[PDB]
Amino acid sequence: NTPWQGYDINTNYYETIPQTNVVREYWFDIVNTTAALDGVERPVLLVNGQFPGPTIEANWGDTVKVHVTNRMENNGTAIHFHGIRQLYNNQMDGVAALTQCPVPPNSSYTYVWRAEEYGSSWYHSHFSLQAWEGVFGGILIHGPSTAEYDHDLGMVFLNDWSHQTVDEMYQSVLESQNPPHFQTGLINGSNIWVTADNQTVGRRFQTEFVPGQRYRLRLVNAAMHTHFRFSIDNHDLTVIASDFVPIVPFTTNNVPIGMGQRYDIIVTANQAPDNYWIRAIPQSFCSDNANSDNIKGVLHYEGAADNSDPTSTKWDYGDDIQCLDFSLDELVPWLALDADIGGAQMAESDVDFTPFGDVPLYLWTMGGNALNISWKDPTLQQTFEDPDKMDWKASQGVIEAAIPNKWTVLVVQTDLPVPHPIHLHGHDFYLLAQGFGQFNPQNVTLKTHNPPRRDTALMTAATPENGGGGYMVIGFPADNPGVWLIHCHIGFHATEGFAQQIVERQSEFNTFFSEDLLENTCDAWDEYAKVNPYGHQYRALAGPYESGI
Ligand SMILES: *[C@@H]1O[C@H](CO)[C@@H](O[C@@H]2O[C@H](CO)[C@@H](O)[C@H](O)[C@H]2NC(C)=O)[C@H](O)[C@H]1NC(C)=O
Ligand SMILES: *[C@@H]1O[C@H](CO)[C@@H](O[C@@H]2O[C@H](CO)[C@@H](O)[C@H](O)[C@H]2NC(C)=O)[C@H](O)[C@H]1NC(C)=O
Ligand SMILES: *[C@@H]1O[C@H](CO)[C@@H](O)[C@H](O)[C@H]1NC(C)=O
Ligand SMILES: [O-][O-]
Ligand SMILES: [Cu+2]
Ligand SMILES: [Cu+2]
Ligand SMILES: [Cu+2]
């Protein structure tokens, strides 16, 4: 009686996709505008004048077709659909410098992809810091669920926020050893703001419950530099999926959610009819936010007082310091799959933060190098011009996975007391290990029996007082030819160099590749760069360094 009739929660979505014959077609203008999301006016870049951008909605098995037209004047654009597998469809992944040139003002790009997973994610620009000026929106793919509920509330975005744009902050961030500071936050694009005169402008997010009913909230952390704990005073939360992977449901009183990650939760309306605070609390070990305790929304029961703030108390779950994921034991995919890593290629990418040049600028290095690649010469252009290319520069940050279905096991490690959300394109990886301190190849234990599986996980780090450092280990099979970004999801870090490209099954790129799709946009882009100085990529060390993204 569903659009995926004949399939269900135990279907292996990596191997089988419902045939729906339906195409969901969107049209996205990327616009240069202003908004007062917490009652203070500021410039924003948005999809169709909205924040968050409109939700892309589809059923499992549909095809989605998104026309993106750049209506801005001084940025290119490219849209990435986060967590979408893009199996044999790498050129639709929307990564400038990898899969395409950026789309210039007054040009378009049509993304087409298959909904070959179900649950919750998001699309966002993958061009420089653009996603965090506002170019992002939900993806909501209907499908089976590991628990029942009554109403689907759709996306719930969590964002940090300042009244200066991230682009305005960037030069300061490049030149500083300290992490960036933000003034406030938004819950699905809303908050109040308290002015210097103690006026309240703006409006808080608010949602309304009927007593007894069960609600699905699809949380997404779209922040630039904040790891949050999300909670609802007095209400427990049943987690039912992490990223695009349904899991064995479990109940908790808060959700720790890093950048790029999603969790689906079911909240039952089982408390006294009242107003309760919804809280999105930046974790202070890796977030610096002036208003940690005032990024709140309002859960309003029918039967509660109207026009009246909650007086509920926060769940006493501990402190709001460390930046942590749910544990490996907590996240058990419903579809059980083992990490078959015998014969895997082993790699390690170290993470460091290093000064460069005379200023200096502080860049993040992954695998030994700050990524330094070219918007106008994308990796797929390089491999089209030279199919057997082997001369990768250190600055291209390459990791090869040349053999079909061979596993890679990648350890991402740091000595620094700084945790990072790692995102891999083109794949759900198997999260084998996450931990603190030094990585111990003799001692570490790798979880291979139905490990958590998802597309974004933290490289956790110890605090300075505990010696700093940490690591995560993922595995994935080479099941998807393409050039796939793996990088830190913090927009400032990635732009500063924290990224590597997986060159997967290079001899099979002609399986998906289209020179016309690449060159049309590349020619448009060069035409724009000839007339507009924002068309040239700044890659030197005395201005706003762009890794290529
Ligand atoms: C959005 O529009 C503003 C203009 O309102 C652009 O900013 C201006 O950029 C020009 C460069 O063409 C500067 O000479 C002006 O000083 C800028 N004005 C302000 C208010 O800073 C901005 O570049 C646009 N952004 C995009 C992405 O197109
Ligand atoms: C990032 O890479 C580019 C190479 O594409 C570097 O720029 C070149 O550097 C040489 C010598 O340093 C210059 O003389 C060339 O004119 C530069 N070419 C371009 C295209 O700008 C750049 O220095 C690198 N940046 C970092 C931080 O290493
Ligand atoms: C948040 O915003 C999206 C996009 O506008 C919307 O579809 C969704 O309903 C919102 N979520 C809630 C819970 O209001
Ligand atoms: O996806 O970043
Ligand atoms: Cu993303
Ligand atoms: Cu980072
Ligand atoms: Cu990415």
Best of 28, 55, 190 for a ligand 3 pocket test (most atoms within 8 Å of beta carbon): 55
State the virtual CA torsion across 43, 533, 223, 283 in degrees, nearest 10.
-110
- Dihedral sign for Cα 82, 222, 412, 449, please: negative
Q: Where in the sequence is the domain holding 181, given as residue range(s)?
A: 145-335
Amino acid at 326: F
How far apart are the CA of 469 and the centre of ligand 6, in A? 13
Q: Say yes or no: 150 and 291 in one domain.
A: yes
**Pair 115, 151 in one domain:** no
| CA–CA distance, 468 with 477 (Å, rounded to integer) | 31
Q: Are residues 260 and 364 in the same domain?
A: no
Assess whether 531 and 393 both reside in one domain.
Answer: yes
449 and 394 inside one domain? yes
For the record, the structure tokens of 508 come out as: 């099979």
Three-state secondary-structure class, residue 381: helix
**SS3 annotation, 84-151:** CCCCCCHHHCCCECCCECCECCCCEEEEEEECCCCEEEEEEECCCCHHHHCCEEEEEEECCCCCCCCE
170 and 260 in a single domain? The answer is yes
Encoded amino acid at 79, one letter: I
300, 316, 335 — which closes off a domain?
335
Please list, residue by residue across 374-411, b when 16 or more beta carbons sit within 10 angstroms of its beta carbon and e when fewer do: bbbebbbbbbbeeeeeeeeeebbbbbbbeeeeebbbbb
Which atom of ligand 2 is least distant from the CA of 541?
27
Instruction: Give the separation between CA 316 and CA 179, rounded to whole angstroms.
Output: 28
539, 541, 545, 549: which to mutate for ligand 2, most atoms within 8 A of CB?
539
CB atoms within 10 A of CB 176: 13
- Of 335, 360, 394, which one is at a domain's C-terminal end? 335
Instruction: Determine the Cα–Cα distance for residues 383 and 3; give it in Å rounded to an integer.
Output: 39
287/352 same-domain check: no
If one counts the domains in the chain, the total is 3
Cis peptide before 282 (omega within 30 of 0): no
Domain CATH number, residue 167: 2.60.40.420
Q: Quick check: helix, strand or coil at residue 479?
A: coil
How far apart, in whole angstroms, are the C-alpha atoms of residue 237 and residue 398? 40
Half-sphere exposure of 60 (CA within 13 A, CB side): 24
Neighbours of 467 (CB within 10 A): 12
Same domain assignment for residues 111 and 160:
no
Q: Which residue's CA is the closest to the ligand 1 atom numbered 23?
A: 74
d(CA 506, CA 482): 7
- Written as one letter, the residue type at 347 is A
Any bridge partners for residue 100, and if so which? 96
Tokens 């006294």 -> residue: 272
| Closest of 416, 417, 420, 362 to residue 176, by C-alpha | 362
> Which ligand is nearest the CA of 484, by number?
7
d(CA 179, CA 244): 30
**Is the CB–ligand 2 distance for residue 541 below 6 Å?**
yes
Q: How far apart are CA 312 and CA 315, in angstroms?
A: 9
Per-residue three-class SS string for 176-232: CCCCCCECEEEECCEEEEECCCCCEEEECCEEEECCCCEEEEEEEECCCCCCEEEEE
> Is there an atom of ligand 4 within 6 Å of 82 CB?
yes
Distance, CA of 496 to CA of 492 (rounded, Å): 6
Q: Do 288 and 258 belong together in one domain?
A: yes
**Residues placed in the known binding site for Cu(2+):** 80, 82, 124, 126, 420, 423, 425, 487-489, 493
Residue 173 sits at φ, ψ, to 5 deg, of -65, -50
CA distance to 141, 231, 385, 425, per residue, from 89 (Å): 18, 37, 19, 12
Element (H, E) at 531: helix 515-531
Q: How many Å separate Cα 343 from the centre of its chain?
A: 30
**One domain, residues 388 and 437:** yes
Placement of tokens 């990886």 in the chain: 429
CB within 8 A of 260, min separation 6: which ones? 82, 221, 421, 423, 455, 456, 489
Q: What's the gap in Å between 95 CA and the centre of ligand 4?
A: 9
Q: Say how many C-beta atoms besides its own lie within 10 A of residue 308's C-beta.
A: 11
437: Cβ–Cβ under 8 A, 6 or more apart, which residues? 462, 466, 467, 468, 469, 470
For 330: left if phi > 0, alpha if psi spans -120 to 50, otherwise beta; the answer is alpha
Positive or negative, the Cα torsion across 357, 360, 366, 368?
positive
- Whether 323 and 426 share a structural domain: no
Residue 152 in contact with ligand 3 by CB distance below 6 A = no
Q: In this structure, how many other beta carbons lie within 10 angstroms of the beta carbon of residue 162? A: 19
Cα gap 240→191, rounded to integer Å: 27
Candidates 300, 106, 124; CA nearest to 204 is: 300
Strand duo 275-282 + 361-366: pairing: unpaired
- Resolution in A, one decimal? 1.7
Does residue 195 share a domain with residue 103? no
Instruction: Select from 124, 144, 164 the last residue of a domain.
Output: 144
Q: Which helix (H) or strand (E) holds 168?
A: helix 166-174
| Residue 234: Cβ within 10 Å count | 18
